[PDB]
Amino acid sequence: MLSIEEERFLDAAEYGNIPVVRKMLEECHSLNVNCVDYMGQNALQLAVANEHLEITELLLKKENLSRVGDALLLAISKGYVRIVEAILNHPAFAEGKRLATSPSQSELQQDDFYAYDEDGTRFSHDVTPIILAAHCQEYEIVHTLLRKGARIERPHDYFCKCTECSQKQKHDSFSHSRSRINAYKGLASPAYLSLSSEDPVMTALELSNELAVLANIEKEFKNDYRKLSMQCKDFVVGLLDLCRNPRQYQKIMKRLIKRYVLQAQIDKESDEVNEGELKEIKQDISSLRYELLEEKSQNTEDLAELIRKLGERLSL
Amino acid sequence: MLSIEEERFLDAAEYGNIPVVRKMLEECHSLNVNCVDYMGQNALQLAVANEHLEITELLLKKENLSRVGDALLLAISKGYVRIVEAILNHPAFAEGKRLATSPSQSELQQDDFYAYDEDGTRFSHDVTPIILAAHCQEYEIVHTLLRKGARIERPHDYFCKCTECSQKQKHDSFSHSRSRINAYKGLASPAYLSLSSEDPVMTALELSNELAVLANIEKEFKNDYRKLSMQCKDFVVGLLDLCRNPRQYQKIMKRLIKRYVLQAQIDKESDEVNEGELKEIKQDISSLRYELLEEKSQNTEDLAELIRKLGERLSL
Amino acid sequence: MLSIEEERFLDAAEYGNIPVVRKMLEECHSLNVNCVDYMGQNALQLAVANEHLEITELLLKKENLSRVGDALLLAISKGYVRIVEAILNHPAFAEGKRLATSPSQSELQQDDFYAYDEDGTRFSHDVTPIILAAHCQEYEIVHTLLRKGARIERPHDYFCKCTECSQKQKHDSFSHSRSRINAYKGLASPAYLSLSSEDPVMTALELSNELAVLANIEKEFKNDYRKLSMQCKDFVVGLLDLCRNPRQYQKIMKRLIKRYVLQAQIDKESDEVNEGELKEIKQDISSLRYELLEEKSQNTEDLAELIRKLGERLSL
Amino acid sequence: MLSIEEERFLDAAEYGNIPVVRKMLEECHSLNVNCVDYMGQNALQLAVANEHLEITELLLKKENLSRVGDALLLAISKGYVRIVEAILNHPAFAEGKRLATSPSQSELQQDDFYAYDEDGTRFSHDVTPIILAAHCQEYEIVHTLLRKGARIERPHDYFCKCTECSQKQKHDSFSHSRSRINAYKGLASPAYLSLSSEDPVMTALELSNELAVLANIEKEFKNDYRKLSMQCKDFVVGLLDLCRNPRQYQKIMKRLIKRYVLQAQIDKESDEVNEGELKEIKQDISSLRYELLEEKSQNTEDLAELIRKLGERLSL
């Protein structure tokens, strides 16, 4: 099943045995990168799912064997930012990986024998931030390149083929659950009020259909909350006048962008507390533990070298 | 009542005085392992109930005097995993201790003059994980050997004798509260839908009796939540078709196992916060405190040795 | 108002500048122990109210000037235990300070120009644990000596004089709010069911009066919760039989003591989280900060001494 | 967009790279203080909004380029105290900056191209503590100088001009939301009951107007809660008599000040937990990480110097 070195390396990747991870990796043994436990653990997914930044850095140093897609979906599926910046600095990125032109075949950084598929066999990596409304990740993605599928309503060329394949329409309502959350339309492309006011007529035309109804009604609710929240955070008369309707308009829009984003980040920081955040704090404490103890052992090794030098001097 | 060394050793076992625990244990005094305070504290139960992993390792190094049963029931009664792996690596385990063939007599790793009996004088150690739905501990136990009592409904050979003894039927309803929680039937033996659908008829036949009624009704509720939750996490048509009803079936079942286990672990990590987790964090901080301070004292001792060597050189 | 050394010493007593507290105290300046800020802060009350154990130890080393009563009432008014054990090891204790024979005059370890009076000008120190139901502090106190006022109902010798003085009857209902909470009657003196069943008739005789009514009704509720909770945690028939009514009786009573105390400590550890616990965690982190940084500065001082010795050797 | 040193300095100002902040600042490069990211981040606002006290100290050491107004509004908008004391020790303060005599023009320590305006283009810095009811900050401010606008009801000299300018009346109701919260009237100027009883007639005269009604009704509710809370915390008859109506009166008022402030601080410390406090704890852990690791690297540098000295001795 599992050798001794595999269990050492996997518990090291779990619990922040960072110098032990070093002394396992820089030894040239048959290290067997991508060892999987009873579930999909993959020795890197554990490092992402437990806030181990430098372990992910050391694993991305070895670009021989990896599974980067589930790693990025873990790092976005929770509120991590540093791990996302570490994963995006990789030669399988930087205008090498897009989302629009893609068949049903799987490949590198598309999960197969996955630990978990997030939400579908055809599922973009810019869909996970918007369902979670994580803003800074969308800054990073749209600053790279806006990754939106630009969904289409029945062209019937190859869309009818995928309609005849399987339950694609769940992914259709899911793709419309992309385009109307707070974070992307608060960051997409200017005159946000125009796009916000062109959404709910389209989702009511979706409500002409009768399959996924209440979800689209909730999307209309979210659009209404957007409109009211944009009407709330206004002080002077000109703010209200251009919320009702050149350079000053774009300045006022950027001001309301800043206000809505910062009040959304305040509203995220006034909630209850999940246990995963305490899991992250415990892993921080354990990483401090192993780093400080084994670098103190390195200090004792340097003192032993100095003692050997002094003993060689005293023997002389 | 208590000597000075006993109070030192007990507060050391409480609060993570790990090098003080070392300098007490490796001295060959009359150390009096298994000293008990005002309640059952036992100098090891404090280490388990306060997240002190290395103290439990050092105490399991001395296999002279111990009380392992309450230690394992503490380590499973809370969400500890490392302490469970430390306790199970012990010569009172590894196919040396089973659960089925057992009389009413107590023995080693069966608590007597206990700090606490968990739920009964005849109570298996694989019952505590399932009431708490801790998954990884059940992976470890069933990977050792599935430990289920395989309960029986009135054979009247010796079961009638224990019926005439005492209130065994509370333990009967308790033993049926084992077999229907999420974690074990999500991990027992394949075609989980068959076992889940054979449960509620049997618990309705229990509802023919009128002693413990609402508990069995709640078990039927939990089975219904299982069935609906298994119907939720499906995407393609074949998933729904084999949830409705060879190799592909077993693959689809393992996929749904992975999905349900990971969404259950996400649902555990989105709750409120008990104070015992902050107790664990405070004990982590205190363990860091004592480790770093007294190993820094060891560093000063090494520098004092180097100073004595340099003074002996300068005197020469 | 405040000199520079006073502000240094007060912020040191707040935030865990433990070696700075050392280098202020062991210097023989006019240190002015008991400096008070804008409110009652007293340079020791800050150490108690912010979890600074070693600072309280160093302040109790200097027994020249102090204010111990408010310190003990802070340490009991929150859930501290180590600070209580540190304060009780003091020559103003250990059968030197009692609670029954006491006039209205204030003295040492009775607060005057206090930061705060807890609940009254005549208020025992064993009343604060029972309102908070902190168990281990009551173990320590009753193990020293049970400190109960043994309240009396209208003797009219000097009780009528204090009745004619002021609103003593608020303290009368408060003194009856001592004697019926979970922790003391779970730890007072055996046959707890007898005392629990003799309480509510007496509090109904208090309900014959009409001043503080709903409080006494709530005390009767708490007594009912006690009786039902004692009826819950029973397994064998003999437990129920002696809960209904020699050596085995005392054994069964001690078993139910252990069970009720441990389930009460579990029920305390499953609640929501107040911000004061995070204040304690932040003060732990700051204490680690200042200890590790300034003892690392001591290590650099020792290395500078070794460098001076090596330079004196190389000059030779 | 951003150079390499700018990204290094900004992530250092975020995450507590305190010796890296030192080695960036004390190098005499074109460091570009006040670099702004995608939103207003300003390299100091990140240090304030993430609990980095020594980074704010090092940034206030360089008084060349700064933005102090948003820094103080961040430090007061959350519950920080040490950062407020660090910011107020600055030559743009100490009776150099007032609040009453001020036109509509912006200047130093008045935000422009701000990250965020808190509540208005004319908004005093003593308004943020009272809406948050932070007590110690108001002690510091009123101990400097009470900063209240002393609002006026229609003088029509220049007040009518600002009435004709814009929506000033939102700031009028906001300025009345200053003067009636718990913290300031619990700390303003004696006979608090007189001011508390002169408030609600004035806010009912505001309720003669019909624009902001329910807010003023809530202010009357808060005044009623004040009056009832002051009536609660009384024990002797004289306390009730002077709450109903010389030296003893002022003593009793100061006693009730102490009692109400300390019970308000207890009521703040019994709430649920926001995630921003865990953000502060994570930043404490990361600051400990970088400090201890890079000062341990300094210790290794000192040992390397000692090794070079010993090698020069052994070569001799």
PDB file of C-alpha atoms in Angstrom, chain B residues 15 38-40 78 114-120 166-167 170 272-276 278-279 281-282 285 289-290 292-293 296 300 303 307, chain C residues 18 54 82 136 139 235 237 240 255 257-259 262 268-273 277 280-281 284 287-288 291-292 295-296 299 302-303 306:
ATOM      1  CA  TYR B  15       0.141  22.359  30.285  1.00  0.00           C
ATOM      2  CA  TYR B  38      -9.636  15.080  42.908  1.00  0.00           C
ATOM      3  CA  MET B  39     -11.243  13.580  39.815  1.00  0.00           C
ATOM      4  CA  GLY B  40      -9.922  10.966  37.426  1.00  0.00           C
ATOM      5  CA  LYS B  78     -13.161  14.666  20.685  1.00  0.00           C
ATOM      6  CA  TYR B 114     -12.422   5.229  35.528  1.00  0.00           C
ATOM      7  CA  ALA B 115     -12.464   8.961  35.222  1.00  0.00           C
ATOM      8  CA  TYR B 116     -15.662   8.415  33.256  1.00  0.00           C
ATOM      9  CA  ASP B 117     -17.489   5.608  31.568  1.00  0.00           C
ATOM     10  CA  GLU B 118     -18.522   6.899  28.154  1.00  0.00           C
ATOM     11  CA  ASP B 119     -21.867   5.219  27.499  1.00  0.00           C
ATOM     12  CA  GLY B 120     -21.980   1.824  29.200  1.00  0.00           C
ATOM     13  CA  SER B 166     -30.659  -5.212  33.658  1.00  0.00           C
ATOM     14  CA  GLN B 167     -31.670  -2.420  31.249  1.00  0.00           C
ATOM     15  CA  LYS B 170     -31.207   1.009  26.238  1.00  0.00           C
ATOM     16  CA  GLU B 272     -20.178  27.756  15.009  1.00  0.00           C
ATOM     17  CA  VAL B 273     -17.193  27.418  17.336  1.00  0.00           C
ATOM     18  CA  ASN B 274     -17.027  25.633  20.671  1.00  0.00           C
ATOM     19  CA  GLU B 275     -14.673  26.775  23.402  1.00  0.00           C
ATOM     20  CA  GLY B 276     -12.757  23.480  23.470  1.00  0.00           C
ATOM     21  CA  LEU B 278      -9.765  27.543  21.809  1.00  0.00           C
ATOM     22  CA  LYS B 279      -8.613  25.391  24.719  1.00  0.00           C
ATOM     23  CA  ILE B 281      -5.163  26.581  20.696  1.00  0.00           C
ATOM     24  CA  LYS B 282      -4.160  27.856  24.153  1.00  0.00           C
ATOM     25  CA  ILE B 285       0.612  28.250  22.552  1.00  0.00           C
ATOM     26  CA  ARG B 289       6.225  28.577  25.131  1.00  0.00           C
ATOM     27  CA  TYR B 290       7.805  25.850  27.224  1.00  0.00           C
ATOM     28  CA  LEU B 292      11.200  27.311  22.949  1.00  0.00           C
ATOM     29  CA  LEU B 293      12.163  28.710  26.362  1.00  0.00           C
ATOM     30  CA  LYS B 296      16.891  28.258  24.503  1.00  0.00           C
ATOM     31  CA  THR B 300      22.755  28.963  26.804  1.00  0.00           C
ATOM     32  CA  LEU B 303      27.391  28.522  25.127  1.00  0.00           C
ATOM     33  CA  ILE B 307      32.881  29.707  27.422  1.00  0.00           C
TER      34      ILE B 307
ATOM     35  CA  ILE C  18       7.998  40.584  31.214  1.00  0.00           C
ATOM     36  CA  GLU C  54       4.391  35.597  35.419  1.00  0.00           C
ATOM     37  CA  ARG C  82      -3.509  29.680  37.436  1.00  0.00           C
ATOM     38  CA  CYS C 136     -12.184  23.965  39.935  1.00  0.00           C
ATOM     39  CA  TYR C 139     -12.590  22.657  44.564  1.00  0.00           C
ATOM     40  CA  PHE C 235     -27.704   3.434  33.279  1.00  0.00           C
ATOM     41  CA  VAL C 237     -31.255  -0.168  37.780  1.00  0.00           C
ATOM     42  CA  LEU C 240     -32.202   4.744  39.444  1.00  0.00           C
ATOM     43  CA  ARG C 255     -20.104   8.248  40.331  1.00  0.00           C
ATOM     44  CA  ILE C 257     -20.820  13.524  40.922  1.00  0.00           C
ATOM     45  CA  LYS C 258     -18.130  12.638  38.375  1.00  0.00           C
ATOM     46  CA  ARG C 259     -20.662  12.225  35.562  1.00  0.00           C
ATOM     47  CA  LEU C 262     -17.784  16.179  33.449  1.00  0.00           C
ATOM     48  CA  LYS C 268     -19.473  24.733  28.940  1.00  0.00           C
ATOM     49  CA  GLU C 269     -17.151  23.748  26.079  1.00  0.00           C
ATOM     50  CA  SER C 270     -20.004  23.755  23.535  1.00  0.00           C
ATOM     51  CA  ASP C 271     -21.114  27.398  23.377  1.00  0.00           C
ATOM     52  CA  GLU C 272     -20.457  30.493  21.315  1.00  0.00           C
ATOM     53  CA  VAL C 273     -17.285  32.541  21.738  1.00  0.00           C
ATOM     54  CA  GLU C 277     -11.013  34.835  24.952  1.00  0.00           C
ATOM     55  CA  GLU C 280      -6.424  36.402  26.066  1.00  0.00           C
ATOM     56  CA  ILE C 281      -5.027  34.804  22.899  1.00  0.00           C
ATOM     57  CA  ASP C 284      -0.453  35.254  24.819  1.00  0.00           C
ATOM     58  CA  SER C 287       3.908  37.797  25.654  1.00  0.00           C
ATOM     59  CA  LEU C 288       5.600  35.265  23.350  1.00  0.00           C
ATOM     60  CA  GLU C 291       9.926  37.074  25.731  1.00  0.00           C
ATOM     61  CA  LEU C 292      11.485  35.576  22.601  1.00  0.00           C
ATOM     62  CA  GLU C 295      15.925  36.742  25.348  1.00  0.00           C
ATOM     63  CA  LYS C 296      17.316  36.614  21.808  1.00  0.00           C
ATOM     64  CA  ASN C 299      21.811  35.649  23.407  1.00  0.00           C
ATOM     65  CA  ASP C 302      26.407  36.537  25.340  1.00  0.00           C
ATOM     66  CA  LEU C 303      27.832  36.291  21.818  1.00  0.00           C
ATOM     67  CA  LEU C 306      32.406  35.745  23.570  1.00  0.00           C
TER      68      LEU C 306
END
